[PDB]
Write a protein that binds this DNA or RNA. Structure first.
Ligand SMILES: [Mg+2]
Ligand SMILES: [Mg+2]
Ligand SMILES: [Mg+2]
Ligand SMILES: [Mg+2]
Ligand SMILES: [Mg+2]
Ligand SMILES: [Mg+2]
Ligand SMILES: [Mg+2]
Ligand SMILES: [Mg+2]
Ligand SMILES: [Mg+2]
Ligand SMILES: [Mg+2]
Ligand SMILES: [Mg+2]
Ligand SMILES: [Mg+2]
Ligand SMILES: [Mg+2]
Ligand SMILES: [Mg+2]
Ligand SMILES: [Mg+2]
Ligand SMILES: [Mg+2]
Ligand SMILES: [Mg+2]
Ligand SMILES: [Mg+2]
Ligand SMILES: [Mg+2]
Ligand SMILES: [Mg+2]
Ligand SMILES: [Mg+2]
Ligand SMILES: [Mg+2]
Ligand SMILES: [Mg+2]
Ligand SMILES: [Mg+2]
Ligand SMILES: [Mg+2]
Ligand SMILES: [Mg+2]
Ligand SMILES: [Mg+2]
Ligand SMILES: [Mg+2]
Ligand SMILES: [Mg+2]
Ligand SMILES: [Mg+2]
Ligand SMILES: [Mg+2]
Ligand SMILES: [Mg+2]
Ligand SMILES: [Mg+2]
Ligand SMILES: [Mg+2]
Ligand SMILES: [Mg+2]
Ligand SMILES: [Mg+2]
Ligand SMILES: [Mg+2]
Ligand SMILES: [Mg+2]
Ligand SMILES: [Mg+2]
Ligand SMILES: [Mg+2]
Ligand SMILES: [Mg+2]
Ligand SMILES: [Mg+2]
Ligand SMILES: [Mg+2]
Ligand SMILES: [Mg+2]
Ligand SMILES: [Mg+2]
Ligand SMILES: [Mg+2]
Ligand SMILES: [Mg+2]
Ligand SMILES: [Mg+2]
Ligand SMILES: [Mg+2]
Ligand SMILES: [Mg+2]
Ligand SMILES: [Mg+2]
Ligand SMILES: [Mg+2]
Ligand SMILES: [Mg+2]
Ligand SMILES: [Mg+2]
Ligand SMILES: [Mg+2]
Ligand SMILES: [Mg+2]
Ligand SMILES: [Mg+2]
Ligand SMILES: [Mg+2]
Ligand SMILES: [Mg+2]
Ligand SMILES: [Mg+2]
Ligand SMILES: [Mg+2]
Ligand SMILES: [Mg+2]
Ligand SMILES: [Mg+2]
Ligand SMILES: [Mg+2]
Ligand SMILES: [Mg+2]
Ligand SMILES: [Mg+2]
Ligand SMILES: [Mg+2]
Ligand SMILES: [Mg+2]
Ligand SMILES: [Mg+2]
Ligand SMILES: [Mg+2]
Ligand SMILES: [Mg+2]
Ligand SMILES: [Mg+2]
Ligand SMILES: [Mg+2]
Ligand SMILES: [Mg+2]
Ligand SMILES: [Mg+2]
Ligand SMILES: [Mg+2]
Ligand SMILES: [Mg+2]
Ligand SMILES: [Mg+2]
Ligand SMILES: [Mg+2]
Ligand SMILES: [Mg+2]
Ligand SMILES: [Mg+2]
Ligand SMILES: [Mg+2]
Ligand SMILES: [Mg+2]
Ligand SMILES: [Mg+2]
Ligand SMILES: [Mg+2]
Ligand SMILES: [Mg+2]
Ligand SMILES: [Mg+2]
Ligand SMILES: [Mg+2]
Ligand SMILES: [Mg+2]
Ligand SMILES: [Mg+2]
Ligand SMILES: [Mg+2]
Ligand SMILES: [Mg+2]
Ligand SMILES: [Mg+2]
Ligand SMILES: [Mg+2]
Ligand SMILES: [Mg+2]
Ligand SMILES: [Mg+2]
Ligand SMILES: [Mg+2]
Ligand SMILES: [Mg+2]
Ligand SMILES: [Mg+2]
Ligand SMILES: [Mg+2]
Ligand SMILES: [Mg+2]
Ligand SMILES: [Mg+2]
Ligand SMILES: [Mg+2]
Ligand SMILES: [Mg+2]
Ligand SMILES: [Mg+2]
Ligand SMILES: [Mg+2]
Ligand SMILES: [Mg+2]
Ligand SMILES: [Mg+2]
Ligand SMILES: [Mg+2]
Ligand SMILES: [Mg+2]
Ligand SMILES: [Mg+2]
Ligand SMILES: [Mg+2]
Ligand SMILES: [Mg+2]
Ligand SMILES: [Mg+2]
Ligand SMILES: [Mg+2]
Ligand SMILES: [Mg+2]
Ligand SMILES: [Mg+2]
Ligand SMILES: [Mg+2]
Ligand SMILES: [Mg+2]
Ligand SMILES: [Mg+2]
Ligand SMILES: [Mg+2]
Ligand SMILES: [Mg+2]
Ligand SMILES: [Mg+2]
Ligand SMILES: [Mg+2]
Ligand SMILES: [Mg+2]
Ligand SMILES: [Mg+2]
Ligand SMILES: [Mg+2]
Ligand SMILES: [Mg+2]
Ligand SMILES: [Mg+2]
Ligand SMILES: [Mg+2]
Ligand SMILES: [Mg+2]
Ligand SMILES: [Mg+2]
Ligand SMILES: [Mg+2]
Ligand SMILES: [Mg+2]
Ligand SMILES: [Mg+2]
Ligand SMILES: [Mg+2]
Ligand SMILES: [Mg+2]
Ligand SMILES: [Mg+2]
Ligand SMILES: [Mg+2]
Ligand SMILES: [Mg+2]
Ligand SMILES: [Mg+2]
Ligand SMILES: [Mg+2]
Ligand SMILES: [Mg+2]
Ligand SMILES: [Mg+2]
Ligand SMILES: [Mg+2]
Ligand SMILES: [Mg+2]
Ligand SMILES: [Mg+2]
Ligand SMILES: [Mg+2]
Ligand SMILES: [Mg+2]
Ligand SMILES: [Mg+2]
Ligand SMILES: [Mg+2]
Ligand SMILES: [Mg+2]
Ligand SMILES: [Mg+2]
Ligand SMILES: [Mg+2]
Ligand SMILES: [Mg+2]
Ligand SMILES: [Mg+2]
Ligand SMILES: [Mg+2]
Ligand SMILES: [Mg+2]
Ligand SMILES: [Mg+2]
Ligand SMILES: [Mg+2]
Ligand SMILES: [Mg+2]
Ligand SMILES: [Mg+2]
Ligand SMILES: [Mg+2]
Ligand SMILES: [Mg+2]
Ligand SMILES: [Mg+2]
Ligand SMILES: [Mg+2]
Ligand SMILES: [Mg+2]
Ligand SMILES: [Mg+2]
Ligand SMILES: [Mg+2]
Ligand SMILES: [Mg+2]
Ligand SMILES: [Mg+2]
Ligand SMILES: [Mg+2]
Ligand SMILES: [Mg+2]
Ligand SMILES: [Mg+2]
Ligand SMILES: [Mg+2]
Ligand SMILES: [Mg+2]
Ligand SMILES: [Mg+2]
Ligand SMILES: [Mg+2]
Ligand SMILES: [Mg+2]
Ligand SMILES: [Mg+2]
Ligand SMILES: [Mg+2]
Ligand SMILES: [Mg+2]
Ligand SMILES: [Mg+2]
Ligand SMILES: [Mg+2]
Ligand SMILES: [Mg+2]
Ligand SMILES: [Mg+2]
Ligand SMILES: [Mg+2]
Ligand SMILES: [Mg+2]
Ligand SMILES: [Mg+2]
Ligand SMILES: [Mg+2]
Ligand SMILES: [Mg+2]
Ligand SMILES: [Mg+2]
Ligand SMILES: [Mg+2]
Ligand SMILES: [Mg+2]
Ligand SMILES: [Mg+2]
Ligand SMILES: [Mg+2]
Ligand SMILES: [Mg+2]
Ligand SMILES: [Mg+2]
Ligand SMILES: [Mg+2]
Ligand SMILES: [Mg+2]
Ligand SMILES: [Mg+2]
Ligand SMILES: [Mg+2]
Ligand SMILES: [Mg+2]
Ligand SMILES: [Mg+2]
Ligand SMILES: [Mg+2]
Ligand SMILES: [Mg+2]
Ligand SMILES: [Mg+2]
Ligand SMILES: [Mg+2]
Ligand SMILES: [Mg+2]
Ligand SMILES: [Mg+2]
Ligand SMILES: [Mg+2]
Ligand SMILES: [Mg+2]
Ligand SMILES: [Mg+2]
Ligand SMILES: [Mg+2]
Ligand SMILES: [Mg+2]
Ligand SMILES: [Mg+2]
Ligand SMILES: [Mg+2]
Ligand SMILES: [Mg+2]
Ligand SMILES: [Mg+2]
Ligand SMILES: [Mg+2]
Ligand SMILES: [Mg+2]
Ligand SMILES: [Mg+2]
Ligand SMILES: [Mg+2]
Ligand SMILES: [Mg+2]
Ligand SMILES: [Mg+2]
Ligand SMILES: [Mg+2]
Ligand SMILES: [Mg+2]
Ligand SMILES: [Mg+2]
Ligand SMILES: [Mg+2]
Ligand SMILES: [Mg+2]
Ligand SMILES: [Mg+2]
Ligand SMILES: [Mg+2]
Ligand SMILES: [Mg+2]
Ligand SMILES: [Mg+2]
Ligand SMILES: [Mg+2]
Ligand SMILES: [Mg+2]
Ligand SMILES: [Mg+2]
Ligand SMILES: [Mg+2]
Ligand SMILES: [Mg+2]
Ligand SMILES: [Mg+2]
Ligand SMILES: [Mg+2]
Ligand SMILES: [Mg+2]
Ligand SMILES: [Mg+2]
Ligand SMILES: [Mg+2]
Ligand SMILES: [Mg+2]
Ligand SMILES: [Mg+2]
Ligand SMILES: [Mg+2]
Ligand SMILES: [Mg+2]
Ligand SMILES: [Mg+2]
Ligand SMILES: [Mg+2]
Ligand SMILES: [Mg+2]
Ligand SMILES: [Mg+2]
Ligand SMILES: [Mg+2]
Ligand SMILES: [Mg+2]
Ligand SMILES: [Mg+2]
Ligand SMILES: [Mg+2]
Ligand SMILES: [Mg+2]
Ligand SMILES: [Mg+2]
Ligand SMILES: [Mg+2]
Ligand SMILES: [Mg+2]
Ligand SMILES: [Mg+2]
Ligand SMILES: [Mg+2]
Ligand SMILES: [Mg+2]
Ligand SMILES: [Mg+2]
Lengths: 48, 275
RNA sequence: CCGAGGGUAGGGCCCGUGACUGGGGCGAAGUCGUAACAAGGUAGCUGUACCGGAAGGUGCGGCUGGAU
RNA sequence: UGGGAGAGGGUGGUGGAAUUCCCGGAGUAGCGGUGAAAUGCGCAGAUACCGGGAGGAACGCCGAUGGCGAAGGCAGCCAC
RNA sequence: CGAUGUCGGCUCGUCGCAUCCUGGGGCUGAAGAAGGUCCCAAGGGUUGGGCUGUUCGCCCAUUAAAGCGGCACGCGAGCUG
RNA sequence: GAAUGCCGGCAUGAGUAACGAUAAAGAGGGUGAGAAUCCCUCUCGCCGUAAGCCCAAGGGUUCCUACGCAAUGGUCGUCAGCGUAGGGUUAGGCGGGACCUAAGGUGAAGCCGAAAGGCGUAGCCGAAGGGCAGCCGGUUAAUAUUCCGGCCCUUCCCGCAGGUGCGAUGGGGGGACGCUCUAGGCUAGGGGGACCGGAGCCAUGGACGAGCCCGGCCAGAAGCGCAGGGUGGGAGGUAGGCAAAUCCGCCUCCCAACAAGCUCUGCGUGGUGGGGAAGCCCGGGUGACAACCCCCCGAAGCCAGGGAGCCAAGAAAAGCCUCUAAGCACAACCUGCGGGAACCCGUACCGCAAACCGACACAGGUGGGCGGGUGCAAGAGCACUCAGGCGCGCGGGAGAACCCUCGCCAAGGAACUCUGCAAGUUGGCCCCGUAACUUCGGGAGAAGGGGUGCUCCCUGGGGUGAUGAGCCCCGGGGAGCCGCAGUGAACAGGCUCUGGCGACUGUUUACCAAAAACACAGCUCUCUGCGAACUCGUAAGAGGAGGUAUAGGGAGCGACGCUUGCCCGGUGCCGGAAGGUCAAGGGGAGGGGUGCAAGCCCCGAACCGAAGCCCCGGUGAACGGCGGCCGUAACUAUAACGGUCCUAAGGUAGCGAAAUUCCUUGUCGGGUAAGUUCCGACCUGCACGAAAAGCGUAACGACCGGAGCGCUGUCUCGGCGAGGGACCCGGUGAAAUUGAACUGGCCGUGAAGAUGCGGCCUACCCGUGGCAGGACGAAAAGACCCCGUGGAGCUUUACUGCAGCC
RNA sequence: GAGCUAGCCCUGGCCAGGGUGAAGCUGGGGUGAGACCCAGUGGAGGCCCGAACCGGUGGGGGAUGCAAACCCCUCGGAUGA
RNA sequence: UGGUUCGUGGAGCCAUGGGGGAAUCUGGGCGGACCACCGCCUAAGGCUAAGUACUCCGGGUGACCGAUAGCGCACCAGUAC
């Protein structure tokens, strides 16, 4: 049947993207966290 | 004269549509429409704030002239009488001798091809707009301003009327469609006659889908819900109310008055409503 | 081919009979009240409507076949 | 053809008496009701009296033993 | 109670005897036929239907008879629901 | 050494289940160390409104070629979506951007919030909507509307010529719109041809034929032709379109009107440029100088912004045109022509799937377009087939039980069972015919029956065309032939009677409930006069509503019909300018402390003092409630009648053993041979009852009862047969579970149900197919139940607070 | 976190074929004029049958599955909430 | 109302949301309600090293670990998944 993951590139980049993260106090903390932890990537990759 | 249908489907048994026989123009004036932005009952937080709304037919808003003291002394010809989905009354398209075109709510007995006018000099004839202090006592009137130059507020739904009762200083006394008696400032404008389409109250929707066409989604009963949702929720099997009948938010919904006591307009209400 | 009639299916009218139920008639001496006949003790009757254990009562309009 | 009397019918209007309610005044110990009462209403100010407002229904005197209509029936006044 | 699945039915048996039938008996208020009662006997047999989830029971038509109980109210790693 | 401990390793079950749709395979020839599995050929079968083709999303090299087989591939592998390496994606016209706006988002101005932040007009962003210039063929191993060939077109810059008051983010026109039905003429697509082109064919009894087989086009500028859309012309006045305005809007006059004219598309034709089958021969080449014509059917697409009807009344903005303002009229714009200029990103490949979503090469899920032919009344249905694409990545045998899916059955025909569950029956079309009842629509496909193929003969109307022939669509009548049987295969209702519930079509517990539940039109109560009530928010601000009592919120009832009684003492709500109580505050009788004293400081009676509460009334489609005992009639029985006790008042109408009745399978009647169910009745209603509505009701129902007919493998009662498994051989090879095991029966015993203790009996060692009585078999630290001063949801006249309101 | 699911908003798309035949219109009849009656045309509907599409009624299979909701037969809606 | 040991307590002190509201030394605050006496101090403006805290970093040292330990990572780890 229809499952939960229905990929969508615009949706991905607009929901979890860098620019979304920076427009919100909680989004900035995420990047501060993920940079402090040393994540290779700060945001989901979407091909665009 | 409301139209009936033969019982050739279960719903057509009671469905009754308006006769539309007084309309003379079947598409709106393009320079006077603008899109009506549908809300679905949602506010600017996006929250539902007025339940059970949405999914109605698409509409364009007709701009309606609720002032008319805009063009004191300038006569206008009644060009057409049109359908409006945003209100219960019909509307009348005026071609002013100005070359200017506007819409008013159509009063009863108005006719295409007639002249209307506005101002203190105007005749006391159906369709003319005057300051209340110049209309003779006893006159039936509609589209009444409530405060001077703020716009027509009262008696605008299909078939309603206000009746001038008497004068007192700068204030006339009105019997509103609700039966209440109120002082309204004499410099407020108003239009002679009652609103048209009086048969509007005898339309029988006949089926659920009709309500849906109007944007009215189905209204579910509190007694049908659960205690998380409503004071009447729950119970094993059906249940009486088991408490004073209440709204989803708890306040009592049988008799409990709710107009604000200290409201400053109280000094101008004379007699609360009837029936 | 028609055809007495047999068979299948569906209708119409009539007659008998039916748990129970509706009022009707009649029946020497039952119970409850007293509605009508006198102004019958609220004049009566009436068409309708509502009501009441029962006769009845009341509303609305009508009639004199109503009395002083 | 020329005349007439009429609450004959329909429609739109409209006048005054009276009752009830509301508002103000003024005024107090009861009012109402009946065969006699009581329920009811009234010092939270009623009844009686004055002024104002709203609303409905029926049209006093004329009026008669009268007029009109096929019958049921038709009564303020104006016009069609 | 870190689980012994809980009615009835179907299926499949199997055991007990306080025996319903069939076999053998004594007594009888046993003439005969037909019964009553008690004794011995478990080899075999012990029907089909209507009603109800029913067990049980009532009913219909038969029968030599239409027995009573146990096996975790026998049997859900066999079925049903 | 134990923690259902943690991490890791290795065992058991076991050579066991399984190897993923029952669409299906066989042979020959290659290749190679190795072949059921790779390549080639022939035969067979499967899809064909797809299982074929083209887009979009998503994926991200998986494409093409060479070279490989350790791992991946459920077997194999020489093969591959795998490994390595090289190659491959070409645009002014296609899509997106350098254009426009929609929801929404953001946001100069402004508003609000302890902070973070929330709003917010304009403006900006935002598309699969508006707008805008490319079609046919060829070519590569792999790209093509991109390269190439042919023929077309757009924008920007510049110059020339002619023309004109030029000039815009400003004014205006336009863009600009729904649903259902639909005309005219075309095209896409298809069918036929005795005509046109073609390599061949004559078989096996016949045919050298008006025979068989194959094909008979596609794109194209200007112009012309056909069919359509769009659109009045002139003048005078003008105060309206937030300046102006010759534009628009309004008024008047004349002229033009199903037209015409102008303009804009579609189709056709059109210089030219291409394509071109079977067959044969090795994707090529021939066929070929290929032919390229007539008739018909004909769209849901095109002309389009067409037409008509309807109510629920159907985006915006730019491009575009027109008007003027600053300006400027050496400019500028308009038109025609000419040259030059024309950027960024995507383009491979999969795309109903082995490449996307599901951990898998997973019987699941995934939006748009094309979807041929014949017959069956139609169609995207059904069967078979074209183009094309596949035979599902383990096989070979055997022919047990048993399981699945399927076929048939003597006689009986629901006797099965909780229940005809399931499976039969019926089954399309045309014709005849069709009941109660009904809201007059319906019930209705009621029920029940007849017809249905082929041949010859005669004839009626329609379309194209021409009125005719041909083609094609509907019929009518008559005579016959064949079989068991003619919707001969496939797809395609069983019916009726009678109850309960719900009016109805709808909605729901994604994944155990589809219902009588929710909703529903309609009915009633109640709030709300507009900065409305109400709702979300601290606020600003929003929804309500750009609505205004015929409207909007809240509540119950639930189409319609006939109806909806009595109680206001308690609780709620509504009204009550008196009286009672009531806090802060006012007031200051009178006390107190301290100081030498002025003073400073503290307590404090009466009295004035809000809402609330008390009190006085109203109110049921507000919360709710609607009696007990005793006696009485000339057979008896039973009480129309009375006595009395209590209540705020004692249940009316209608219904009643009921979706409600305990006793209960009440009693009687019906139906059956027999009826705890069903229907109809009675009424001592444990415990119906009138908008948590009462009683009925046509029609409707995958709802739930009862009966009948039809027909059946449901059953008496079982038999036989098919295929896919199970079984055997070759290949690959899991699982939960598992203290260890050398693991029998009985009668006892034991923590009370023993393979393991006692006594006795029985018993050589090890498997394989099967069956499920036991190992209190497996699975889940019982959901039931209790316990814990464990937890959470929910309620209220529990407690105590808070929002909110007064 | 609303790429599943629920509701709404904006903008697009989809619904083979067949059956029944409302209003209205025309004509006819009727009447003082009407209502109304017949025929024709017309093509309405939370109308009927049935694919696509959306569902998920009954039963059977599946139950360490093809699948952490599937498969077969059957069945509901299919111009509308 | 907050702070303080101070939870309304005899409740001062310090701070302040609201209301009322001075004086410039003979002015004003405090010494735990309040008054006297005796004393302490000068509110309603600002700045000010050092001694104090911490360890991304660098070094020194361990009756610290020694690859299931020591950081999650001795290794291409905030990776693969
Ligand atoms: Mg889903
Ligand atoms: Mg999706
Ligand atoms: Mg995307
Ligand atoms: Mg997208
Ligand atoms: Mg998106
Ligand atoms: Mg983003
Ligand atoms: Mg976001
Ligand atoms: Mg890096
Ligand atoms: Mg992130
Ligand atoms: Mg109707
Ligand atoms: Mg009717
Ligand atoms: Mg109208
Ligand atoms: Mg516009
Ligand atoms: Mg809005
Ligand atoms: Mg908003
Ligand atoms: Mg609301
Ligand atoms: Mg809403
Ligand atoms: Mg209207
Ligand atoms: Mg409205
Ligand atoms: Mg006013
Ligand atoms: Mg209404
Ligand atoms: Mg609407
Ligand atoms: Mg409603
Ligand atoms: Mg509801
Ligand atoms: Mg409920
Ligand atoms: Mg519920
Ligand atoms: Mg909740
Ligand atoms: Mg709660
Ligand atoms: Mg609650
Ligand atoms: Mg409740
Ligand atoms: Mg409930
Ligand atoms: Mg409930
Ligand atoms: Mg209950
Ligand atoms: Mg109730
Ligand atoms: Mg209750
Ligand atoms: Mg309440
Ligand atoms: Mg009022
Ligand atoms: Mg005969
Ligand atoms: Mg015979
Ligand atoms: Mg006696
Ligand atoms: Mg008498
Ligand atoms: Mg009398
Ligand atoms: Mg008397
Ligand atoms: Mg009475
Ligand atoms: Mg008194
Ligand atoms: Mg007094
Ligand atoms: Mg009144
Ligand atoms: Mg237990
Ligand atoms: Mg265990
Ligand atoms: Mg267990
Ligand atoms: Mg258990
Ligand atoms: Mg004898
Ligand atoms: Mg004996
Ligand atoms: Mg025996
Ligand atoms: Mg029984
Ligand atoms: Mg038992
Ligand atoms: Mg029993
Ligand atoms: Mg015998
Ligand atoms: Mg037994
Ligand atoms: Mg027992
Ligand atoms: Mg027991
Ligand atoms: Mg048992
Ligand atoms: Mg058992
Ligand atoms: Mg079981
Ligand atoms: Mg059992
Ligand atoms: Mg078991
Ligand atoms: Mg077993
Ligand atoms: Mg067991
Ligand atoms: Mg079950
Ligand atoms: Mg059950
Ligand atoms: Mg130990
Ligand atoms: Mg261990
Ligand atoms: Mg543990
Ligand atoms: Mg472990
Ligand atoms: Mg391990
Ligand atoms: Mg290891
Ligand atoms: Mg291992
Ligand atoms: Mg071992
Ligand atoms: Mg092994
Ligand atoms: Mg084994
Ligand atoms: Mg297995
Ligand atoms: Mg498997
Ligand atoms: Mg299959
Ligand atoms: Mg072969
Ligand atoms: Mg082979
Ligand atoms: Mg091979
Ligand atoms: Mg090999
Ligand atoms: Mg194969
Ligand atoms: Mg091959
Ligand atoms: Mg086909
Ligand atoms: Mg992938
Ligand atoms: Mg390999
Ligand atoms: Mg290999
Ligand atoms: Mg290698
Ligand atoms: Mg492998
Ligand atoms: Mg596999
Ligand atoms: Mg090789
Ligand atoms: Mg490539
Ligand atoms: Mg190009
Ligand atoms: Mg540029
Ligand atoms: Mg911040
Ligand atoms: Mg955006
Ligand atoms: Mg676009
Ligand atoms: Mg649009
Ligand atoms: Mg383009
Ligand atoms: Mg072109
Ligand atoms: Mg090449
Ligand atoms: Mg020009
Ligand atoms: Mg428009
Ligand atoms: Mg518009
Ligand atoms: Mg419509
Ligand atoms: Mg054809
Ligand atoms: Mg051409
Ligand atoms: Mg002007
Ligand atoms: Mg060729
Ligand atoms: Mg050649
Ligand atoms: Mg289409
Ligand atoms: Mg079009
Ligand atoms: Mg049109
Ligand atoms: Mg806009
Ligand atoms: Mg100038
Ligand atoms: Mg110049
Ligand atoms: Mg650029
Ligand atoms: Mg490409
Ligand atoms: Mg699929
Ligand atoms: Mg693939
Ligand atoms: Mg596979
Ligand atoms: Mg798949
Ligand atoms: Mg097609
Ligand atoms: Mg073809
Ligand atoms: Mg067919
Ligand atoms: Mg195969
Ligand atoms: Mg397949
Ligand atoms: Mg396979
Ligand atoms: Mg074998
Ligand atoms: Mg099969
Ligand atoms: Mg046979
Ligand atoms: Mg048979
Ligand atoms: Mg039978
Ligand atoms: Mg039979
Ligand atoms: Mg039966
Ligand atoms: Mg059942
Ligand atoms: Mg039954
Ligand atoms: Mg069939
Ligand atoms: Mg048939
Ligand atoms: Mg009948
Ligand atoms: Mg009938
Ligand atoms: Mg019937
Ligand atoms: Mg009926
Ligand atoms: Mg009928
Ligand atoms: Mg039939
Ligand atoms: Mg025939
Ligand atoms: Mg034949
Ligand atoms: Mg024959
Ligand atoms: Mg059918
Ligand atoms: Mg229901
Ligand atoms: Mg229903
Ligand atoms: Mg009902
Ligand atoms: Mg009903
Ligand atoms: Mg209903
Ligand atoms: Mg469910
Ligand atoms: Mg559930
Ligand atoms: Mg679930
Ligand atoms: Mg349910
Ligand atoms: Mg259903
Ligand atoms: Mg529900
Ligand atoms: Mg309903
Ligand atoms: Mg109703
Ligand atoms: Mg709130
Ligand atoms: Mg705040
Ligand atoms: Mg608004
Ligand atoms: Mg309901
Ligand atoms: Mg009726
Ligand atoms: Mg009460
Ligand atoms: Mg009360
Ligand atoms: Mg009271
Ligand atoms: Mg009150
Ligand atoms: Mg109660
Ligand atoms: Mg009570
Ligand atoms: Mg009554
Ligand atoms: Mg009863
Ligand atoms: Mg009974
Ligand atoms: Mg009942
Ligand atoms: Mg009951
Ligand atoms: Mg009972
Ligand atoms: Mg019982
Ligand atoms: Mg019985
Ligand atoms: Mg009987
Ligand atoms: Mg009784
Ligand atoms: Mg109830
Ligand atoms: Mg009914
Ligand atoms: Mg019915
Ligand atoms: Mg239904
Ligand atoms: Mg149903
Ligand atoms: Mg039956
Ligand atoms: Mg069988
Ligand atoms: Mg077989
Ligand atoms: Mg062997
Ligand atoms: Mg092997
Ligand atoms: Mg392997
Ligand atoms: Mg051991
Ligand atoms: Mg051992
Ligand atoms: Mg052993
Ligand atoms: Mg043994
Ligand atoms: Mg024991
Ligand atoms: Mg034992
Ligand atoms: Mg042993
Ligand atoms: Mg032992
Ligand atoms: Mg031992
Ligand atoms: Mg021992
Ligand atoms: Mg032993
Ligand atoms: Mg022993
Ligand atoms: Mg033994
Ligand atoms: Mg074996
Ligand atoms: Mg075995
Ligand atoms: Mg076993
Ligand atoms: Mg155990
Ligand atoms: Mg066991
Ligand atoms: Mg066991
Ligand atoms: Mg479990
Ligand atoms: Mg548990
Ligand atoms: Mg436990
Ligand atoms: Mg529980
Ligand atoms: Mg317990
Ligand atoms: Mg406790
Ligand atoms: Mg304790
Ligand atoms: Mg607790
Ligand atoms: Mg409130
Ligand atoms: Mg969504
Ligand atoms: Mg979604
Ligand atoms: Mg459809
Ligand atoms: Mg038909
Ligand atoms: Mg017709
Ligand atoms: Mg028509
Ligand atoms: Mg329908
Ligand atoms: Mg039909
Ligand atoms: Mg579904
Ligand atoms: Mg299913
Ligand atoms: Mg079935
Ligand atoms: Mg499952
Ligand atoms: Mg399936
Ligand atoms: Mg099926
Ligand atoms: Mg439907
Ligand atoms: Mg259907
Ligand atoms: Mg359809
Ligand atoms: Mg719709
Ligand atoms: Mg403190
Ligand atoms: Mg203190
Ligand atoms: Mg000084
Ligand atoms: Mg001093
Ligand atoms: Mg001082
Ligand atoms: Mg101080
Ligand atoms: Mg001090
Ligand atoms: Mg001191
Ligand atoms: Mg000091
Ligand atoms: Mg300062
Ligand atoms: Mg320092
Ligand atoms: Mg060490
Ligand atoms: Mg290690
Ligand atoms: Mg480590
Ligand atoms: Mg270590
Ligand atoms: Mg570190
Ligand atoms: Mg580690
Ligand atoms: Mg790594």
């Amino acid at each position: 049947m229809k499952r939960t993951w229905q990929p969508n590139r615009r949706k991905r980049a607009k929901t979890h993207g860098f620019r979304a993260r920076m427009r919100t106090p909680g989004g900035r903390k995420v990047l501060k966290r993920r940079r402090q932890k040393g994540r290779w990537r700060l945001t989901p990759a979407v091909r665009k | 004269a409301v139209k009936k249908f033969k019982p050739y489907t279960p719903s057509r048994r009671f469905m009754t549509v308006a006769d539309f026989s007084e309309i003379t123009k079947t598409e709106p004036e393009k320079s006077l429409v603008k899109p009506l932005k549908k809300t679905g009952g949602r506010n600017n937080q996006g929250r539902i704030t007025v339940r059970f709304r949405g999914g109605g037919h698409k509409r364009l808003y007709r701009i309606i002239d609720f002032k008319r003291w805009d063009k004191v002394g300038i006569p206008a010809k009644v060009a057409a009488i049109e359908y409006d989905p945003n209100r219960s009354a019909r509307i009348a398209l005026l071609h002013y001798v100005d070359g200017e075109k506007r819409y008013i709510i159509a009063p009863d007995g108005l006719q295409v091809g007639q002249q209307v006018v506005a101002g203190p000099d105007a005749p006391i004839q159906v369709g003319n707009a005057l300051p209340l202090r110049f209309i003779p006592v006893g006159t039936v009137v509609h589209a009444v301003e409530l405060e001077p130059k703020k716009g027509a507020k009262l008696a605008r739904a299909a078939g309603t009327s206000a009746q001038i009762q008497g004068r007192e200083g700068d204030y006339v006394i009105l019997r509103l469609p609700s039966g209440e008696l109120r002082k309204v400032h004499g410099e407020c404008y108003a239009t002679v006659g009652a609103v048209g389409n009086a048969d509007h109250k005898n339309i029988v929707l006949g089926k659920a889908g009709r309500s849906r066409w109007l944007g009215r989604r189905p209204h579910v009963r509190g007694a049908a819900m659960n205690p998380v949702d409503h004071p009447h929720g729950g119970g094993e099997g059906r249940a009486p109310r088991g408490r004073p009948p209440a709204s989803p938010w708890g306040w009592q919904t049988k008799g409990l008055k709710t107009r604000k006591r200290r409201k400053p307009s109280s000094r101008f209400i004379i007699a609360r409503r009837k029936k």
